[PDB]
PDB file of C-alpha atoms in Angstrom:
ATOM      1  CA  UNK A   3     -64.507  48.232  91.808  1.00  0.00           C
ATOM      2  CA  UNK A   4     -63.180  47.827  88.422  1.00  0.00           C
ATOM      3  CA  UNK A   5     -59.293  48.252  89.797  1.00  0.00           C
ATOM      4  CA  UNK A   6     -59.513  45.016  91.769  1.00  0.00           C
ATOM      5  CA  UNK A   7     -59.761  43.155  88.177  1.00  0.00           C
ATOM      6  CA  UNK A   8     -56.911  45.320  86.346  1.00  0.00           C
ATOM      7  CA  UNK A   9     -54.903  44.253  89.330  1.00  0.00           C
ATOM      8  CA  UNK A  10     -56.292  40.431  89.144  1.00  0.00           C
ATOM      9  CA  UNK A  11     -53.190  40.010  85.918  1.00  0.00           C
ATOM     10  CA  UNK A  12     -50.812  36.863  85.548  1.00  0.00           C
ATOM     11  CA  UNK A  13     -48.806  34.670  83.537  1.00  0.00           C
ATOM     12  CA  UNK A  14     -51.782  33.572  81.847  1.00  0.00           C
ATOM     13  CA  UNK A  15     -52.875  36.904  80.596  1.00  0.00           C
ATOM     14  CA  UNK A  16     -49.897  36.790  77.754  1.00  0.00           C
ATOM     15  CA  UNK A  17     -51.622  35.755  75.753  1.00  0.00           C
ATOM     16  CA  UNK A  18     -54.470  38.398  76.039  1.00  0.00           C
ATOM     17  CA  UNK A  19     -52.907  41.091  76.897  1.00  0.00           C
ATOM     18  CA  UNK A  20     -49.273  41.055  77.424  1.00  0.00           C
ATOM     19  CA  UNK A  21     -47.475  42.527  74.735  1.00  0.00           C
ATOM     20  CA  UNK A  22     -50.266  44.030  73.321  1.00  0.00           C
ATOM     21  CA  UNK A  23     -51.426  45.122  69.902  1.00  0.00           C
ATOM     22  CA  UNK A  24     -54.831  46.635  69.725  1.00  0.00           C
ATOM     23  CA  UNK A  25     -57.224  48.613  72.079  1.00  0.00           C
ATOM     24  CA  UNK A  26     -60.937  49.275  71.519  1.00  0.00           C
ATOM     25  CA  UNK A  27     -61.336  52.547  73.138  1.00  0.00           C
ATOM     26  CA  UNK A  28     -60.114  55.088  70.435  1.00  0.00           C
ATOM     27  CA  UNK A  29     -61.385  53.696  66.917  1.00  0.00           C
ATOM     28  CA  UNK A  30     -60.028  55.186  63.762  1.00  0.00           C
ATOM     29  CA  UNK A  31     -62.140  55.249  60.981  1.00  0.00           C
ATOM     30  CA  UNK A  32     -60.804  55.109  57.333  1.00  0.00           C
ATOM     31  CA  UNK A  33     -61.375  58.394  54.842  1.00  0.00           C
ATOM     32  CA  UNK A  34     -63.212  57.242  51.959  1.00  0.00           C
ATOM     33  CA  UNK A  35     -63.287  58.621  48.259  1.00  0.00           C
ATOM     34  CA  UNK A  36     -66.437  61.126  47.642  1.00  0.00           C
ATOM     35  CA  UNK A  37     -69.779  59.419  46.222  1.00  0.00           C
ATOM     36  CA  UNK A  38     -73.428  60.013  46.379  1.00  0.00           C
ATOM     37  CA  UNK A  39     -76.127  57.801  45.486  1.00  0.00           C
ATOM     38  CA  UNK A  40     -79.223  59.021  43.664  1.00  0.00           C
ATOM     39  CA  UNK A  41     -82.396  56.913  42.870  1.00  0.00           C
ATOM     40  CA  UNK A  42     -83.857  56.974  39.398  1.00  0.00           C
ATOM     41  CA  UNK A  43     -86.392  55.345  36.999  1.00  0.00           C
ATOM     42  CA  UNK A  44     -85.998  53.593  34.337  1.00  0.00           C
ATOM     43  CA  UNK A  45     -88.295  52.914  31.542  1.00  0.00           C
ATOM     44  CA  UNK A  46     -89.737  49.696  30.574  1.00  0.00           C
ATOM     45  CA  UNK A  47     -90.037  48.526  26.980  1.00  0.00           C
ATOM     46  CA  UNK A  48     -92.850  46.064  25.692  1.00  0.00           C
ATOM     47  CA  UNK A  49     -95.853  45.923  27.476  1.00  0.00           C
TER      48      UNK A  49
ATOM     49  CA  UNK B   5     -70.572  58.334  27.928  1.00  0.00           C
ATOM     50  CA  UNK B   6     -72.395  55.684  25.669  1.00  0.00           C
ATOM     51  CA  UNK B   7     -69.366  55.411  23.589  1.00  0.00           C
ATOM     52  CA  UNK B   8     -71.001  55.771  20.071  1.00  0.00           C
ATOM     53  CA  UNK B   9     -68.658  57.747  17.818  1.00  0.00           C
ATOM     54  CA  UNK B  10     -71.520  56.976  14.873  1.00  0.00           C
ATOM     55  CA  UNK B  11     -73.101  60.180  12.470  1.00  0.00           C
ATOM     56  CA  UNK B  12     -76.158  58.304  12.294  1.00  0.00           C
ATOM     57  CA  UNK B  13     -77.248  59.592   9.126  1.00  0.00           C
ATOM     58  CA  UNK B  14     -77.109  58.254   5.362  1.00  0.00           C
ATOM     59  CA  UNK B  15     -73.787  60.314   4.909  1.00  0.00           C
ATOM     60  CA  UNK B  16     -70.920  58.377   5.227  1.00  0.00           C
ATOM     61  CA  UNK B  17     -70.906  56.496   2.419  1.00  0.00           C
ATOM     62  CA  UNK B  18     -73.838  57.202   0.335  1.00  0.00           C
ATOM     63  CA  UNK B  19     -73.143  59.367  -2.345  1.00  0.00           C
ATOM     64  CA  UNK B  20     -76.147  61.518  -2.625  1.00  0.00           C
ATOM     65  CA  UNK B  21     -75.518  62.717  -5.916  1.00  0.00           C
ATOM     66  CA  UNK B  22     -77.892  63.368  -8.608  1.00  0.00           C
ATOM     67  CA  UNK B  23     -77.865  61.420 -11.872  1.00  0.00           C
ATOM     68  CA  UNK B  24     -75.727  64.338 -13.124  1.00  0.00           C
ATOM     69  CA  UNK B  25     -72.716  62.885 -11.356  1.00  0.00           C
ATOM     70  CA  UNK B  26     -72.557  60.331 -13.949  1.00  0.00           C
ATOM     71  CA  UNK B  27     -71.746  63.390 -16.465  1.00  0.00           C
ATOM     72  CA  UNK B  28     -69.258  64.855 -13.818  1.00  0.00           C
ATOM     73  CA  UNK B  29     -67.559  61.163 -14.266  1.00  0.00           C
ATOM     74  CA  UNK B  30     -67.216  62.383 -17.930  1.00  0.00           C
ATOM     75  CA  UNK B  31     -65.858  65.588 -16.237  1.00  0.00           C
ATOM     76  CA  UNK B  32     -63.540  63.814 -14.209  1.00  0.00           C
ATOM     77  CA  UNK B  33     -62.552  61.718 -17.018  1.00  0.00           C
ATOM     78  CA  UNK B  34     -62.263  62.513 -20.385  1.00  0.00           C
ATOM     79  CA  UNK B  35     -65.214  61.154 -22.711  1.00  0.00           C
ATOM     80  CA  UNK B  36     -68.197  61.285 -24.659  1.00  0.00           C
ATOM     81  CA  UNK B  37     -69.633  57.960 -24.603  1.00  0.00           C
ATOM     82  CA  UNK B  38     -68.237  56.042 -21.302  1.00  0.00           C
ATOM     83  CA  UNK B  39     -70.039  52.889 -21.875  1.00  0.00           C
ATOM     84  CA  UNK B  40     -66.693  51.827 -23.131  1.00  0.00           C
ATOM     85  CA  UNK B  41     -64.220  53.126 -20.603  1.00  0.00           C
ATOM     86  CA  UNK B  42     -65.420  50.792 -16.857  1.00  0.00           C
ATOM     87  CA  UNK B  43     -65.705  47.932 -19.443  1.00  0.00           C
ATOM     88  CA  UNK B  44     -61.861  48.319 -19.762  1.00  0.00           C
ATOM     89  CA  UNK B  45     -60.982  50.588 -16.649  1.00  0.00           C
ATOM     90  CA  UNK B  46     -62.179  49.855 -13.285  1.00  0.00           C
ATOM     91  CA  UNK B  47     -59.460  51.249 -11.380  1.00  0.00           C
ATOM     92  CA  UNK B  48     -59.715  54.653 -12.046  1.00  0.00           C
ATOM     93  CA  UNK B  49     -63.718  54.197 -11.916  1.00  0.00           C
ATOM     94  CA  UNK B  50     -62.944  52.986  -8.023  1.00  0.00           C
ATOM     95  CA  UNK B  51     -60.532  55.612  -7.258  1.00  0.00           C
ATOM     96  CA  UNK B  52     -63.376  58.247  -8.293  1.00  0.00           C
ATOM     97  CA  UNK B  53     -65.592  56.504  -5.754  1.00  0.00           C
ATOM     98  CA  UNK B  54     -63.453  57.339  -2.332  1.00  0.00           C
ATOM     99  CA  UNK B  55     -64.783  59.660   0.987  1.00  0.00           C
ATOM    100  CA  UNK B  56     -62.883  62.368   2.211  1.00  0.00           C
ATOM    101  CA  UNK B  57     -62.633  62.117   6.444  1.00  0.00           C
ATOM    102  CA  UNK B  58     -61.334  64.627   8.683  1.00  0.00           C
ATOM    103  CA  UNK B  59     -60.521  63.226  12.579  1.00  0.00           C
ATOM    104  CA  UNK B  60     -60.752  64.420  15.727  1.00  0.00           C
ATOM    105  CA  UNK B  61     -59.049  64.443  18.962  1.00  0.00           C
ATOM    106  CA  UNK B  62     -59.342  64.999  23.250  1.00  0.00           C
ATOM    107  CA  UNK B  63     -57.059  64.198  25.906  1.00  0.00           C
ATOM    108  CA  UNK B  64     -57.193  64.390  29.955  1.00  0.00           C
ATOM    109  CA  UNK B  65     -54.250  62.999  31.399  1.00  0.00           C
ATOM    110  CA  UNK B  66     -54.215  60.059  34.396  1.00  0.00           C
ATOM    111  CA  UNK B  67     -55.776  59.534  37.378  1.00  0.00           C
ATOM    112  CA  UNK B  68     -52.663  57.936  40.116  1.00  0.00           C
ATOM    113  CA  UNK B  69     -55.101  56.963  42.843  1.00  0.00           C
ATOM    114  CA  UNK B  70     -54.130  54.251  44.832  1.00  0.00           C
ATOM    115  CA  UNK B  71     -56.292  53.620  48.256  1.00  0.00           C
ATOM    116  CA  UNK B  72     -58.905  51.712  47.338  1.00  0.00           C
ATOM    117  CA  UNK B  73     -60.666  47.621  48.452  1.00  0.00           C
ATOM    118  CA  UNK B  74     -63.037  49.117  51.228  1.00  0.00           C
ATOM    119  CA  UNK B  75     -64.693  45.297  52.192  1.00  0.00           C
ATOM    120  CA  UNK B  76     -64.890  45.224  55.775  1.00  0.00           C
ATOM    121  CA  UNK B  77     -66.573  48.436  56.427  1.00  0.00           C
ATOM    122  CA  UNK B  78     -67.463  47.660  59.663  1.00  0.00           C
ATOM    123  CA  UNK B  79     -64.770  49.389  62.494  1.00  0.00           C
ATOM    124  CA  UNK B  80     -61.424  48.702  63.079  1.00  0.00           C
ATOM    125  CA  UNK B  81     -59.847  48.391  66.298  1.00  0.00           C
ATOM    126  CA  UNK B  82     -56.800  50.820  66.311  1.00  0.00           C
ATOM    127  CA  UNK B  83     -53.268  49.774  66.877  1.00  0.00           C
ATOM    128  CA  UNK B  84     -51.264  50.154  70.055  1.00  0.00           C
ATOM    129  CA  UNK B  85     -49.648  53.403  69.105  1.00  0.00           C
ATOM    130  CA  UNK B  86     -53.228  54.714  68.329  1.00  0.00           C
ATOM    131  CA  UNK B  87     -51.474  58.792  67.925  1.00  0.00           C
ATOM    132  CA  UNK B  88     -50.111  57.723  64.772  1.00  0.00           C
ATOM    133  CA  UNK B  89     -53.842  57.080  62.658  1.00  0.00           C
ATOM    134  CA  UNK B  90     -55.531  59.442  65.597  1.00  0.00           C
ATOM    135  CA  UNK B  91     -54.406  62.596  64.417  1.00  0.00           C
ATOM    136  CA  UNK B  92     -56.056  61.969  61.393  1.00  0.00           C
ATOM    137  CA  UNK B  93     -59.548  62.275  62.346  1.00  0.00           C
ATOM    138  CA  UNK B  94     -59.442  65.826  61.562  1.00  0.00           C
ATOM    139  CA  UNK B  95     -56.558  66.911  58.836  1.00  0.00           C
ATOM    140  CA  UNK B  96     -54.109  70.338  58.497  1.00  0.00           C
ATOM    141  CA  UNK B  97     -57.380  71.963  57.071  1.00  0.00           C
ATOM    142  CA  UNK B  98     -59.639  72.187  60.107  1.00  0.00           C
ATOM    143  CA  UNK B  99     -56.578  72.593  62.409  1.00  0.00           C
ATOM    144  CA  UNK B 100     -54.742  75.376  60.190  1.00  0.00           C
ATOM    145  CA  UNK B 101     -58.494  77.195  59.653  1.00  0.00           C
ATOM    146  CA  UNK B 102     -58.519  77.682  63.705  1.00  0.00           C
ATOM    147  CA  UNK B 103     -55.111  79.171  63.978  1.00  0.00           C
ATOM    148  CA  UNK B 104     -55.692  81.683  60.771  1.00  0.00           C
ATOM    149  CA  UNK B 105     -59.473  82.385  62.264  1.00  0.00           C
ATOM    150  CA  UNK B 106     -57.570  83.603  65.657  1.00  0.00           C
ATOM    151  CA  UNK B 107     -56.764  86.896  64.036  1.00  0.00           C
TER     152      UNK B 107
END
């Protein structure tokens, strides 16, 4: 199964994953300020 | 928050006096026939012709808030040492609130 490719690692994987930086498995969002969005109407002058 | 600081009405300079505030000129001055006096005098005429204002003021400090440029909104892959941003994704509120709530 899927240990046969974690195993499968070499010289050539520095520059993948040696040393590495990021993962993808435990995302952290970013807070954000507090907003809303309403829609409303406007009114349209002339005819 | 139009930012119009206008009356809007025929008050601030327009002198709605009657024709009897030519005789309180007299009163302010001191005549009986004035068609002689802004002929010679406009200075003091002009300095009887000046609006009284009264100001006003408000105040509400500063807003320091720095954290902002939001563009990529998408997701962000987390950083090796992911238990530095991951203890984050609930704050001190929702983890002190469970401790208090145990008695």
């Amino acid at each position: 199964g899927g240990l046969s490719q974690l195993v499968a690692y070499g010289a050539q994987d520095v520059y993948l994953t040696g040393n590495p930086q990021i993962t993808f498995f435990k995302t952290v969002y970013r807070r954000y300020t507090n907003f809303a969005i309403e829609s409303i109407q406007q009114t349209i002058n002339g005819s | 928050f139009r930012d119009t600081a206008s009356i809007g009405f025929s008050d601030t300079h327009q002198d709605e006096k009657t024709l009897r505030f030519l005789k309180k000129q007299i009163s302010q001055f001191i005549k009986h026939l004035k068609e002689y006096y802004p002929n010679n005098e406009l200075t003091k005429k002009l300095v009887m012709k000046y609006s009284d204002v009264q100001l006003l003021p408000y105040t509400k400090g500063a807003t320091k808030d720095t954290y902002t440029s939001g563009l990529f909104d998408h997701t962000t892959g987390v950083i090796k040492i992911a238990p530095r941003d991951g203890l984050g994704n609930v704050r001190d509120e929702q983890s002190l609130n469970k401790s208090i709530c145990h008695e």
